[PDB]
Design a protein around this ligand. Sequence first.
Ligand SMILES: CCOC(=O)C1=C(COCCN)NC(C)=C(C(=O)OC)[C@@H]1c1ccccc1Cl
Ligand SMILES: [Ca+2]
Ligand SMILES: [Ca+2]
Lengths: 219, 219, 219, 219
Amino acid sequence: MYLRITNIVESSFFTKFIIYLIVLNGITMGLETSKTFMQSFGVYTTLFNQIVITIFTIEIILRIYVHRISFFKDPWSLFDFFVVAISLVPTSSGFEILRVLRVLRLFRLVTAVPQMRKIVSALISVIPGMLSVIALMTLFFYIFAIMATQLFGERFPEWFGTLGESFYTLFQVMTLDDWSNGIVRPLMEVYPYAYVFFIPFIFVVTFVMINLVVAIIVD
Amino acid sequence: MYLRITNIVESSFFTKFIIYLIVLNGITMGLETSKTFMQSFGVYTTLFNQIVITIFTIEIILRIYVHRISFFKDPWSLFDFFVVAISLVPTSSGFEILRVLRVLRLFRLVTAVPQMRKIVSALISVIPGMLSVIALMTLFFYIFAIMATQLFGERFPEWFGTLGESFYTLFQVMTLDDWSNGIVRPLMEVYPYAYVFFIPFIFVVTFVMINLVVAIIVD
Amino acid sequence: MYLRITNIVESSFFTKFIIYLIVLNGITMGLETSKTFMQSFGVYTTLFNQIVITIFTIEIILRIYVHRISFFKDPWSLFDFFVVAISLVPTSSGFEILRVLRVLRLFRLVTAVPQMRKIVSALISVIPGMLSVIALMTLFFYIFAIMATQLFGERFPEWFGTLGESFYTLFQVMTLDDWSNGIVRPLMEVYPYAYVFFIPFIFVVTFVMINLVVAIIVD
Amino acid sequence: MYLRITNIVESSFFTKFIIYLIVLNGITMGLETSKTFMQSFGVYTTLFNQIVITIFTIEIILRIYVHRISFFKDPWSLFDFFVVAISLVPTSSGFEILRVLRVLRLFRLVTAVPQMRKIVSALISVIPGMLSVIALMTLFFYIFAIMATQLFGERFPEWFGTLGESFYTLFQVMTLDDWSNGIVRPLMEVYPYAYVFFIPFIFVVTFVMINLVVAIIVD
Ligand SMILES: CCOC(=O)C1=C(COCCN)NC(C)=C(C(=O)OC)[C@@H]1c1ccccc1Cl
Ligand SMILES: [Ca+2]
Ligand SMILES: [Ca+2]
């Protein structure tokens, strides 16, 4: 049982079969967005979907029989598992949010094609070093979202009315998005000195980012 | 036998000759953007344009005989062929869009000047290195684009009603252009949790951009 | 007395205890954001503040005795002093900015954690080589803030009414924030040549920044 | 006697005297922005301004006598001569824009301190290596500005009606400033395929700039 399977799963037909299906699922998945296509030829796709989800599910079980415990020490394999799991509950009508996360199964093309798997991997490896600067900036953000809710949330509740809202606005400013004519200049109509909160915030927030990148470059 | 033409063309005089026609036409084409000038100089420049396309056409024909199979495997010359081809498509044969693409021919100044070529050659050379990333990025856009249409299209048809539109909106968010007050904030009036899609989207797409750029540096 | 006091403050138990308090007071400050909660539990936390600021007050007092004159040559410790001291000025005195400046004590997580201390010094470390670039820019900004105020402050007071105002708008244009549809297209309606001011300005300002970034890498 | 003066100009008292002066005139021109100041002390500052303009004209006369033809191959002095000349043309009888140009002499602070001069030369020095890329791109803009005037200048004159207008708008898109909700979405209400034009453009202009920064950094 273990032995007949092992020769199937590692073959250039098993992975090729699965990979071809991903590209197919992904083209049909574009089509599922058209309400035109749905009326005449979409009953076709809902079941096509269910064949692939079964085909992937069987594939995963086999790979877990073959690789056993070493399956769940593979981040790429773990991804495939969790991506195919949540992608298994039928549309049902219990809820709608779970239905749209399903498209994430096109990210299997990344797990299974080697050129792509390494860039992603190369990219992730930049992150562990940055995890200090991220934490720092979040604490920095945190100290500042608190300053902002209390300072501006009474006259500008949409922007700063809530800790959450304050973070959101604070993120926006960092990306420099309609930040002045759009947020600070109004803020300044009530609170003329709001510029003492946001220009420092901007220098700092931008300084750290540039240096986060320099440290990326050098490292 | 008929070397002599082959001799004729390669002349140092000849080459800067076709360059001088480019620079003159490039100037005259700017002038054609002015309403004043074309009325009282139009036939002079509608004529001057017809001459140049012909000489360029004969120039293209001659160069083929000398190089044979090699001509159509020269990147700079293939370009040369087609932007010349465009002006040979009839002016009243379809829409007037082809009349506008004629001005793509001023780029021959890029193909005809080695320092131009050198930058262009250098720049493109960056690209094969990035073919893996572009594939990744385009896959990522494609995936997040589908989710948008099924998540936001019916209440926001202009921005998300459709894949191409969703693509577009997502491309816009990636240029960080008015993304929050202009798109995501409205979205949040009806779909309060929209910050969960668009902010991760921002983090990821900004991230890949930043890091890839480093790669051009190290390489 | 001397060595016993010197021995608990330097202890690993003390600072962990203090840190835990920093982490607690910070979560608590996040809690004062839901005004449902604050009207329902705020008295517990307004004095919770006071005893937290008490313990921190003690630690500050001991460390000065323990390090004597060597305390006040330490930038990180000085900061702690000041960031706490501020919080000792009465919440009903001066004005209500002081109440908000109290949140900066949360920057002690950086002070009291050496991994954080690691990051910051590195960052701070890049500034001295930049001072020279910083100086030139500010003089540049200052001249143009003068030029802009005399030119546009009359018909456009919000933006250029005052040197301080032109300073703000120019920083805004620098961040490249809604600089065209939002500021200079309107200027150009009265002063059609306004582009001769802002576009050169942007070339310079954008140019210096890049090279500044380049300078950082090399430095 | 002999060139008694020649000894003095070099003297590290003469230069320091001018720098102290510029900074005074720089301080003066600032206060000239206060509408209130120009009442209370407006007469005092014109006096101060006229002496300085004279002293500087004198300082320029001496320096040319000493350096002769070598004065007019020093860019810094050439800049100084034309910057001093400007502040001397009559305040009336014509173009009062020139009344504003005379603030450019504040750029003398740079002129007389050999650090800023050093930085500026350092800065200027990266431009020739870039000059190539400036030419391709300018060529690219010129060609696309032409394309945009012919395609969108009819129904959208404010933005693209004139070549200069297409340049200005196109520069803006490049600066990525409010480009979708602000330019391309409107166009697209009339011309649905306008994204096939601007989106590649956006790719190209952004691709080039990033590789440009890279070329600066490695060397
Ligand atoms: C040239 C005078 O600028 C200042 O003194 C200001 C300071 C001095 O603080 C310097 C800290 N950056 N804070 C900053 C930052 C301001 C500014 O406008 O620049 C962005 C102001 C300002 C002054 C007068 C009228 C309005 C304003 Cl808003
Ligand atoms: Ca913006
Ligand atoms: Ca904007």
